[PDB]
């Protein structure tokens, strides 16, 4: 308890010595409270005017327009200790899984140089404002690195002074840049060296991209076995047990020297003991602590969520196959049965899964998996939107399975070749492209973000009539040489380029596509198919509405409206790449 966290707590106490008070009316029940201090501060979603002016029919669709407007009764709940049989299953599986992931990889420290390069190309490293303005300036100043050094040597000594979380759909634990550095130095290798690539982890999809995820699900569907299960966990990050954090820490068993000590300190001092500052309007700042749940950098969180989800799903597969009888206790001969299953078939069983952090698809050996719920529930990985002991409902067709907010279509080109394409309800896609985050956007910066959405649509969602038309309109309305941008950048964004989008389409879908045997390039956008018109409507198309027909017919007028706002620049007309504007 206070031996490991007190020092961090002590230090915050003194910087607000004028304000410290143990509030008697504190709302915490599962979080250990410690004190409050005085602050007074808050980032709403702003509309992208370039995208909205070129998507007029959606101005009267509430599912789009409501997205731009506007549970902590789940962070403040508790998870029970798993039974002894469950703890044994997790420990054997985790031991086995780090060894498999480690066979073709070497753990190593990430460098100041690597960290500096990341900051100088705008990645989301979840850091706070204070002594320097931005991340770019702290990294170019030697004083920073001396603070990093002090903390670094405190960790080698097994103590922590400044590694404190600041809490703020999605929960992010902002730390100061220095604490983020030390996390990256010790555990960055998991992402930097692709430990959760499909080649390395067999279940993982790190670095894949939406042009690959549908082909991966179709390959899983080809295995003999039962339904495809895609059960979401209710509040995954809140269900990570202290036993989970201890099995994750076993990656340190594969390390040596300074690295092993620096990694052991991240896990012991920051992950398995947390210090958090939270804004309460009663506006004060509460200093709360707890031992369990996930609270790490976004990138480390993705890797360890993937690890622990692979572990949980192998165990659910073991339960379905009758490898063990009860979670109450594993007998000595069950332990050897479990180890032997892992050695014998473990890699085959990993290949039956697609796992992206808390998100999974599993094609088990048979449908016994559906009612194999004892280990899953006892590990705390309770399924969302279904009663605890009700058997899972599986999917009979890989094209129906949800994964990473998409489903996937099989789309046959006029020349017979097969595309497996990503898809989701079109209101969601249009609604997101109409939103920006943060202040100080110039018209040029707003235009270049619209262009990023348009090029993503061309590459990933070309098969949706409305999005190929709107993408061509936005690319016609934004100056041809202006570079697409994002302010927040495990997937490949091939659309972030000033290269011709037909050339990028050929590279992604034909040349580098390992599922496409015939490498014959496509010569025009007219060779690139759409979904069936009825399927396009099913997935949210406005094709057939009077509003949509008027928009398509008069698109030049909309393009010209945006060009007139941006001013006298060099523009290209991309509409004649479409049959209906080609005379
Ligand atoms: O566990 C995670 N789940 C998803 C949702 C589906 C893709 C991965 N997102 C994440 C992003 C950062 C960190 C963790 C996660
Ligand atoms: Zn620290
Ligand atoms: Zn669809």
TrEMBL record:
Q: Which residues bind CTP?
A: 170, 235-237, 305, 384
Domain RdRp catalytic: from-to ranges = 226-372
Which range is the signal sequence, renumbered to this chain?
none
- Name the domain of life: Viruses
* Residues binding Zn(2+) 2, per UniProt: 407, 409, 423, 539
Which parts of the sequence bind Mg(2+) 2?
Answer: 232, 359
Q: Which residues bind Mg(2+) 1?
A: 232-233, 358
Binding of Zn(2+) 1, residues: 151, 155, 160, 163
Q: Where in the cell is it found?
A: Host endoplasmic reticulum membrane; Host mitochondrion; Host nucleus; Secreted
Q: What does this protein do?
A: Regulates the ATPase activity of the NS3 helicase activity. NS4A allows NS3 helicase to conserve energy during unwinding. Plays a role in the inhibition of the host innate immune response. Interacts with host MAVS and thereby prevents the interaction between RIGI and MAVS. In turn, IFN-beta production is impaired. Interacts with host AUP1 which mediates induction of lipophagy in host cells and facilitates production of virus progeny particles.
Complex and partners? Homodimer; in the endoplasmic reticulum and Golgi. Interacts with protein prM. Interacts with non-structural protein 1.
Q: What is this protein called?
A: Genome polyprotein
The scientific name of the source species is Dengue virus type 2 (DENV-2)
The upper taxonomy is: Viruses, Riboviria, Orthornavirae, Kitrinoviricota, Flasuviricetes
């Amino acid at each position: 308890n206070l031996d490991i966290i007190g020092k961090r707590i002590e230090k915050i106490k003194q910087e607000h010595e004028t304000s410290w008070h143990y509030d008697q009316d504190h709302p915490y029940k599962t979080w250990a409270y410690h004190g409050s201090y005085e602050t007074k501060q808050t980032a709403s979603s702003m509309v992208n005017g370039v995208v909205r002016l070129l998507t007029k029919p959606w101005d009267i669709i509430p599912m789009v327009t409501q997205m731009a407007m506007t549970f902590k009764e789940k962070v403040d709940t508790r998870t029970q200790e798993p039974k002894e049989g469950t703890k044994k299953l997790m420990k054997i599986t985790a031991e086995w899984l780090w060894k498999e992931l480690g066979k073709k990889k070497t753990p190593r420290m990430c460098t100041r140089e690597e960290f500096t390069r990341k900051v100088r190309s705008n990645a989301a490293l979840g850091a706070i404002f204070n002594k320097w303005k931005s991340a770019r300036e702290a990294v170019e100043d030697s004083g920073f690195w001396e603070l990093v050094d002090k903390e670094r040597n405190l960790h080698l000594e097994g103590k922590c002074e400044t590694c404190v979380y600041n809490m703020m759909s999605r929960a992010i634990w902002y730390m100061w840049l220095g604490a983020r550095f030390l996390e990256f130095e010790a555990l960055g290798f998991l992402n930097e060296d692709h430990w959760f690539s499909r080649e390395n982890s067999l279940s993982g999809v790190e670095g894949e991209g939406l042009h690959k995820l549908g082909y991966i699900l179709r390959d899983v569907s080809k295995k003999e076995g039962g339904a495809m299960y895609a059960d979401d966990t209710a509040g995954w990050d809140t269900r990570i047990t202290l036993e989970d954090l201890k099995n994750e820490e076993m990656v340190t068993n594969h390390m040596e020297g300074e690295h092993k000590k620096l990694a052991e300190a991240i896990f012991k001092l920051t992950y398995q003991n947390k210090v958090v500052r939270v804004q309460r309007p009663t506006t004060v700042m509460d200093i709360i602590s707890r031992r369990d749940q996930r609270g790490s950098g976004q990138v480390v969180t993705y890797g360890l969520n993937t690890f622990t989800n692979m572990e949980a799903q192998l165990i659910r597969q073991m339960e379905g196959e009758g490898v063990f009888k009860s979670i109450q206790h594993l007998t000595v001969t069950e332990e050897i049965a479990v180890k032997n299953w892992l050695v014998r078939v473990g890699r085959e069983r990993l290949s039956r899964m697609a796992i992206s952090g808390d998100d999974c698809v599993v094609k088990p050996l048979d449908d016994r998996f559906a009612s194999a719920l004892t280990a899953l529930n006892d590990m705390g990985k309770v399924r969302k939107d279904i009663q605890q002991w009700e058997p899972s409902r599986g999917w009979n067709d890989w094209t129906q399975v949800p994964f990473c907010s998409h489903h996937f279509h099989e789309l046959i080109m006029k020349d017979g070749r097969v595309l497996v394409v990503p898809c989701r309800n079109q209101d969601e896609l249009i609604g997101r492209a109409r939103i920006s985050q943060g202040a100080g956007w110039s018209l040029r910066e707003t235009a270049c973000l619209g262009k990023s959405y348009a090029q993503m649509w061309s590459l990933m969602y070309f098969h949706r009539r409305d999005l190929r038309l709107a993408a061509n309109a936005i690319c016609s309305a934004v100056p041809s040489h202006w570079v697409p941008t994002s302010r927040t950048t495990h997937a490949t964004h091939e659309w972030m380029t000033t290269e011709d989008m037909l050339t990028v389409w050929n590279r992604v879908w034909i040349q580098e596509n390992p599922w496409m045997e015939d490498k014959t390039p496509v010569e025009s956008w007219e060779e690139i198919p759409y979904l069936g018109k009825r399927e396009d409507q099913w997935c949210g198309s406005l094709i057939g509405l009077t509003s949509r027909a008027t928009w398509a017919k008069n698109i030049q007028t909309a393009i010209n409206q945006v060009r007139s706002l941006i001013g006298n620049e060099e523009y290209t007309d991309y509409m004649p790449s479409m049959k209906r504007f080609r005379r």
